[PDB]
Each structure stands twice: as C-alpha cells, then as structure tokens.
Amino acid sequence: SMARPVSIGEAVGIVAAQSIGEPGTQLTMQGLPRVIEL
C-alpha cells in the first residue's frame, strides 16, 4: 500500500486473507470451486 519495507506490527495474515477473499466475493457478483478445492 506504500511501496516500501513493511512496518513492524502489520497484521500480515488478515491483509493476505482479505486480499485473497476480496476478488473471489467480487468476481462472483471452474474458478472459485477450484480455489476452494486448493
């Protein structure tokens, strides 16, 4: 989000989870089933 070394304390896991989840939920409203299967 800032194009620089990550600040210590950054909630990485949440950001990753939302970054994977957001496109899926939006690009819904053999794609997502495969993703879930993986």
Binding site: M2, R4, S7, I8, G9, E10
Partner: protein, 94 residues
C-alpha cells in the same frame, strides 16, 4: 493528506510507532493545558472561529507539528514512567 506525512514516515522504522508517539504526545499536551508545548506562538496551529484566529483544540495536529519540528525525543527505555509523570506535572501544573 496530512502535512509532511512522508517525513514522519521517514522519521520512524514503523508507522505504528509514529502513531503511538503522536497519540501519547497528544495526551501529554491535552492533560497539561498545552503549556508544555515546544512550539512558538507563530508556529502554534490555529483555527478560524467567528471571532478570529484561536489556538487549535485538536492536540493530535499539535503533536504532529511538534513532531515535525524535531523538538521531541522518541525511543524505548529513555525514562521511567513515574519520574516523567511527576516531573512534567511539576513543571506544568494541571
């Protein structure tokens, strides 16, 4: 955006430390009645009321300006808590 936020992000190793510093300094200024400020009357942030230019109530903005000046020391293990509280409350009554 916030005035010179890139400089502030340059000041710290992590933005969250910056946030902590700003918040703590804001509380410091808020509790002592701004008396402990390291700003000069011309550097003091102002709001435009219907009367005129008065000092900015928002202590956060004050904290960011003072932090921009470079007249504040940050870091860990610099001074025991109770000592700082006592001495600061001594220098600037409430």
């Amino acid at each position: 955006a916030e005035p010179g936020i890139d400089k502030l992000f340059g000041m710290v190793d992590s933005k969250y430390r910056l946030t902590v510093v700003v918040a703590k300094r804001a509380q410091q200024l808020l509790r002592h009645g701004f008396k402990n400020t390291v700003l000069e009357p011309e550097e003091r942030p102002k709001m435009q009321t219907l009367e005129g230019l008065f000092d900015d109530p928002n202590a956060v903005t004050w904290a960011m300006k003072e932090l921009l000046t470079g007249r504040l020391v940050f870091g860990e293990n610099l001074v025991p808590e109770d000592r700082l509280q006592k001495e600061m409350e001594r220098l600037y009554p409430v």
